[PDB]
Design a protein around this ligand. Sequence first.
Ligand code: HEM
Ligand code: HEM
Ligand SMILES: *[C@@H]1O[C@H](CO)[C@@H](O[C@@H]2O[C@H](CO)[C@@H](O)[C@H](O)[C@H]2NC(C)=O)[C@H](O)[C@H]1NC(C)=O
Ligand SMILES: *[C@@H]1O[C@H](CO)[C@@H](O[C@@H]2O[C@H](CO)[C@@H](O)[C@H](O)[C@H]2NC(C)=O)[C@H](O)[C@H]1NC(C)=O
Ligand SMILES: CCCCCCCCO[C@@H]1O[C@H](CO)[C@@H](O)[C@H](O)[C@H]1O
Ligand SMILES: CCCCCCCCO[C@@H]1O[C@H](CO)[C@@H](O)[C@H](O)[C@H]1O
Ligand SMILES: *[C@@H]1O[C@H](CO)[C@@H](O)[C@H](O)[C@H]1NC(C)=O
Ligand SMILES: *[C@@H]1O[C@H](CO)[C@@H](O)[C@H](O)[C@H]1NC(C)=O
Ligand SMILES: *[C@@H]1O[C@H](CO)[C@@H](O)[C@H](O)[C@H]1NC(C)=O
Ligand SMILES: *[C@@H]1O[C@H](CO)[C@@H](O)[C@H](O)[C@H]1NC(C)=O
Ligand SMILES: O=C(O)c1ccccc1O
Ligand SMILES: O=C(O)c1ccccc1O
Lengths: 551, 551
Amino acid sequence: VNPCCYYPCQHQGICVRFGLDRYQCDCTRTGYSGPNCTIPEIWTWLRTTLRPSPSFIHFLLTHGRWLWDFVNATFIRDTLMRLVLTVRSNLIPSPPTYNIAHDYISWESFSNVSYYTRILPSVPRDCPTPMGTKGKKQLPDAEFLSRRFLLRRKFIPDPQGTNLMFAFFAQHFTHQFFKTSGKMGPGFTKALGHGVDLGHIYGDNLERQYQLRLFKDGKLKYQMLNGEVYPPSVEEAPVLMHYPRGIPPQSQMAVGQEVFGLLPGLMLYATIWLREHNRVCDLLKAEHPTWGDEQLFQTARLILIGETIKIVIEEYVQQLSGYFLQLKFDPELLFGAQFQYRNRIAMEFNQLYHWHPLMPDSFRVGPQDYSYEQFLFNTSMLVDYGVEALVDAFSRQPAGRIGGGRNIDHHILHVAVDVIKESRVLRLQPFNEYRKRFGMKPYTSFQELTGEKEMAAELEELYGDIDALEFYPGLLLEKCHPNSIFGESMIEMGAPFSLKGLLGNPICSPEYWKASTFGGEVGFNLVKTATLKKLVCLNTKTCPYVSFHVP
Amino acid sequence: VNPCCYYPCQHQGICVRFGLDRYQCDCTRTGYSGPNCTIPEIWTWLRTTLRPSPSFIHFLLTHGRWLWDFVNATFIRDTLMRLVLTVRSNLIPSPPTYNIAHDYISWESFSNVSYYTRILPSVPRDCPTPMGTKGKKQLPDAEFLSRRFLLRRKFIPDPQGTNLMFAFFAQHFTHQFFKTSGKMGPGFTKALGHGVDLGHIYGDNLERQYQLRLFKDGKLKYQMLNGEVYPPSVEEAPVLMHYPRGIPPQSQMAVGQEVFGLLPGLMLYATIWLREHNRVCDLLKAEHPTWGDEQLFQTARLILIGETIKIVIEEYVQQLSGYFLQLKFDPELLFGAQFQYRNRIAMEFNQLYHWHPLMPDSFRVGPQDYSYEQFLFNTSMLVDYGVEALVDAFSRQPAGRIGGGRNIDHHILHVAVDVIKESRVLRLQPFNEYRKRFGMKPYTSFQELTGEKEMAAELEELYGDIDALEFYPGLLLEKCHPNSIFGESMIEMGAPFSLKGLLGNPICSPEYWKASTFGGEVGFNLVKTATLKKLVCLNTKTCPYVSFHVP
Ligand code: HEM
Ligand code: HEM
Ligand SMILES: *[C@@H]1O[C@H](CO)[C@@H](O[C@@H]2O[C@H](CO)[C@@H](O)[C@H](O)[C@H]2NC(C)=O)[C@H](O)[C@H]1NC(C)=O
Ligand SMILES: *[C@@H]1O[C@H](CO)[C@@H](O[C@@H]2O[C@H](CO)[C@@H](O)[C@H](O)[C@H]2NC(C)=O)[C@H](O)[C@H]1NC(C)=O
Ligand SMILES: CCCCCCCCO[C@@H]1O[C@H](CO)[C@@H](O)[C@H](O)[C@H]1O
Ligand SMILES: CCCCCCCCO[C@@H]1O[C@H](CO)[C@@H](O)[C@H](O)[C@H]1O
Ligand SMILES: *[C@@H]1O[C@H](CO)[C@@H](O)[C@H](O)[C@H]1NC(C)=O
Ligand SMILES: *[C@@H]1O[C@H](CO)[C@@H](O)[C@H](O)[C@H]1NC(C)=O
Ligand SMILES: *[C@@H]1O[C@H](CO)[C@@H](O)[C@H](O)[C@H]1NC(C)=O
Ligand SMILES: *[C@@H]1O[C@H](CO)[C@@H](O)[C@H](O)[C@H]1NC(C)=O
Ligand SMILES: O=C(O)c1ccccc1O
Ligand SMILES: O=C(O)c1ccccc1O
């Protein structure tokens, strides 16, 4: 039996098989010694014995508004902000390690970027069970598993007050790096940027960019409807889009992210960001009359990437975390650390970001309450209503609790079923293993995972061992932090993926974080001072209620 | 007139144009303040006032064998070795900056790797002269310039004792990252690895790899001739090669670097390294009976990359530098520094590596003395003679002095003419500017550059201003260090390009420099203990004189 199936090596040691039987754990720089990397070093032991519970830390970061307000106003902010950054980022490896194709480091894994990387090698195809050593020889029927525990019965709204504006933002945003290759199979991605390259705006390939490009003042092609700016028509800018057959080019918006074409929510943001890139071009042109198209274009894109990363950290992540510490985007807090300004999308991080439970039961656009059947492909709602309008709406309606269970609207429940299946193809290791890998202690019972006894009892008969509970179901079915949108593992496993993928962008490097990179103090400030509100409102005839938090 | 043409911004400040006229220098983190980044900071001034002449340093590193021997045996070795590494690496920017297409940072420059990057933006196409502000309005006719100063009259051998074994090594080696795209124009490269990916052995693209692959024990296809191993035939492994029309597949060796097909020197090494990869596979298979093709293949490639980087630093660079300090390859000397494990090939670094003057007047293979006319495409010399034989030969014959002037054999003189021309297309800035950029003070006269008065006088009438002397000619025509293969600028500008491109490989990162990456302590040591001699001799029936230094 493959010894590595027993996941022998601890604390990130590497299981290497030898001989027919045998295996050896590589505990290089692990912090532990021993045959399974279990015997700590004085400092390592001392370090972990004092490491305060993730739960505790969370508690602190969410209480004492008063105390925190003071802190946010002292230097201690940056101090912490930096600390968070560093310690968080360390769990994610760089350079990348393994891929769907290699549970080893190989030059090809490091070079071929069509692959999504992974943090934990697959459960060896020669293990006795589909999870390794424990559990049933067959896993719960996803359809069922999804219908029994992820299927929304009564809408549970997210307590943080996360509204639709955030739900759509998160969607649209994450759809620039999660873009699994259809024809290539799972574990392959079309987004070769692996990060925030704003490729869903400019196109995932050069040709497609040139298509959406106006080639005048560095602008992106667009069109006027009701004397307002929207993306161009597929007719105008002949790019490939995904619209149900029967919808004509003249009625399709060309945009950069083929899929975005079906959900006014997506196209809404796609219009704001287009509008923005065009506006920035005009600014640049003022300062640089001597500038050319590309120079302008290229520079604008650099600025937006800046805007995007700021809004994402200070407004988005703030909301999602509910922390009282005011997060801050300042790539200089890292100029002292040993950070690698590079990022590669993890298949695990893709699963984890399947926050479908945010989606509501019905989409209320004022007195009007639309159905999925009226939302899902409506090629007119955007133009009809207008940016400002829809923004106000989405800003007001709440999105559902993410973690917790049974909160995924049936219209998109299939997605989650597919996620489970896909996971298995990827031979993803067990939830409990990942619990460890990301600093946590594994669950000892289904009753501990979920906060209750009922479904914890069924999962038990279903899976057979907490040590066999899968990644995604484990993430979605774990008990939620007091009044949080989700629980411990979501944060403890997601945050590193998130923060490494945000600071590890070439523009956060000391090399590019020069004001010249952005066209001067002008462009630079745009980056240094972005706001979700400024984003919408400067590109709309009238500023509505804009916020990730429902009023 | 474009103000940036005057190269106003000092010490790496960035010239940004503004308004029709105007310009502003971005001295962010430059070390200087001021309108042109000229007013130092106390520490910066203090730092440069003590910075000992590069010449001095060189002197020290080349005398006192006695004193050095002691030092090489103390910890002080590592100490220095590390220092060299860090301080050297800093001149090369990471992430990369500009490209043939953009004299600005642009996401596209950071993403599109078909581009060779550059350290210094081009001389703006709107400047009054082809070099900016100084010099003639037309540059010296390359053909002439090459015939008057680079054309060998009497062979000057390199004093360091560099032989042909080194000349060919350097050639073959550098032909894995210098691989300019024919159909794409200058400034475009086919080697998307930008470093030591050993792509000239395994192929520059996946398909081509699979072609040269045997798919058994992780081996590379090969063939037997005289009961000895050589690469396979183009017939056997149908890969694309470059052989004059009329040479049949059955008579062509398939190898990985299409061009290598024409020069027994290249194919000689290509055979050694193939032989090696196959041998390592056998080792791996012993330890890992349970291993598969890919696992074996992939792992072997990782080990060779290791071997290659060791031989390159400790034997190759040692010889080429003539230092008494014993250089050392230990990626851990960097685990403390803030280094970025990534590398991108500089167009400037490509020019600089055009060491054609190494090539002899005639190739002596024992009593036999062959002509270029008998060497240049001889599809049999290798098989005829045998690895061991040719190795001994090349190890004994000396190669010419690189720097100095008039030492390029006429058979390949065209190459240098083309280099000059190509430079101009790239609109490469002036030698003197690069002198500064890499820490040096610019030459004040042609007589100072060259050690003499004669040709210094002609270059003067030719160029018109030392401030107009071009990159390559300036490198090749500058006065050689006492008994060195070349002068100051070659080392001061080449070493950083070299050392950053050697340590900035993902395997030198603390993430991959685990013994598990190489299949265990076995593979690991292969890397940790490589020798040019071990390389040849373990793959040959008999060990000959092998060395980069002529006996
Ligand atoms: C009207 C609402 C939405 C619909 C109809 C929807 C549907 C889908 C579908 C069908 C897929 C493809 C996999 C499959 O075949 O099941 C997908 C993938 C995914 N969705 Fe959504 N989704 C919605 C909202 C969201 C939101 C709000 C987010 C952001 C949390 C999100 C995150 C993801 C992610 C990250 C993937 C993976 C994409 C990839 O790897 O290519 N989705 N979604
Ligand atoms: C029999 C000896 C050699 C011949 C016939 C030769 C010839 C050439 C030729 C023709 C090119 C293409 C450019 C052109 O059209 O002129 C080339 C490029 C170059 N050679 Fe050689 N060379 C020889 C030895 C060397 C050696 C010893 C080195 C190593 C120092 C070297 C380094 C280079 C470099 C780096 C390039 C640029 C390649 C690229 O960018 O694609 N060559 N050589
Ligand atoms: C990246 O890796 C994938 C898988 O190794 C490569 O895709 C396959 O490549 C082989 C050889 O060309 C083909 O037989 C397959 O049909 C390819 N497609 C898929 C979906 O597997 C891909 O070519 C690699 N890309 C690079 C640039 O190396
Ligand atoms: C890398 O950059 C080069 C130049 O920008 C791209 O090559 C050109 O791309 C355009 C659009 O496809 C074509 O019109 C040219 O014919 C292409 N070839 C050359 C030699 O310029 C190249 O496509 C880019 N590669 C990527 C992956 O972005
Ligand atoms: C108020 C104190 C702020 C400290 C900020 C540290 C950021 C959170 O750090 C996280 O802590 C977890 C629990 O120790 C670990 O498991 C994670 O690896 C780590 O990223
Ligand atoms: C015996 C002393 C060894 C010192 C090793 C330092 C490595 C050489 O360092 C070089 O020195 C040059 C001159 O100062 C600078 O111009 C270069 O930028 C730097 O890389
Ligand atoms: C190492 O791990 C294996 C598998 O979990 C176990 O059987 C073995 O006893 C462990 N050895 C030690 C010393 O912990
Ligand atoms: C599309 O939405 C509009 C409002 O924007 C609504 O009037 C119309 O009926 C919808 N069409 C469909 C097919 O749902
Ligand atoms: C800045 O540089 C320009 C161009 O070399 C020069 O004309 C100008 O006088 C300089 N200004 C200062 C203060 O050095
Ligand atoms: C090729 O080299 C061999 C020796 O290896 C020599 O005998 C033969 O004449 C050469 N052929 C050519 C065309 O130079
Ligand atoms: O810093 C965090 O804890 C965090 C948590 C969730 C999402 C983003 C984050 O930065
Ligand atoms: O360290 C150096 O000075 C050096 C010089 C030339 C070539 C390689 C090198 O490492």
